[PDB]
């Protein structure tokens, strides 16, 4: 199934994860059909350690919607924020 999760990540000075996807982006390693923004790698001793995992779909960040967001806009937002970033993600969970 799926679930939404709030995730706070404190930049130090990066978030410590990578993303792929977005409208106008090249897709993602997880779902062919989805234009969403997906977490693809998490630095193991970085700020997102234990909080995010590859395959998490970002649908909001500091109150900005990431649903069908363009690739460049998502990168710009995440890179522009400072200090704390409050994410909402959709995580797939084992049946």
């Amino acid at each position: 199934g799926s679930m939404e999760i709030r995730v706070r990540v404190e930049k130090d000075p990066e978030l410590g994860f990578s993303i792929s996807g977005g409208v106008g982006g090249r897709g993602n390693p997880f779902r062919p059909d989805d234009d969403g923004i997906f977490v693809t790698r998490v630095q193991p001793e970085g700020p997102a350690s234990k909080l995010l995992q590859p395959g998490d779909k970002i649908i909001q960040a500091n109150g900005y919607s990431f649903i069908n967001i363009e690739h460049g806009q998502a990168v710009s937002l995440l890179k522009t924020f400072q200090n704390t970033v409050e994410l909402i993600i959709v995580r797939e969970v084992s049946s």
């Binding site: 990066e14 994860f17 990578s18 993303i19 792929s20 693809t40 990168v75 890179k79």
Partner: peptide, 5 residues
């Protein structure tokens, strides 16, 4: 290419 943030 993924993008580190």
């Amino acid at each position: 290419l993924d993008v580190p943030v």
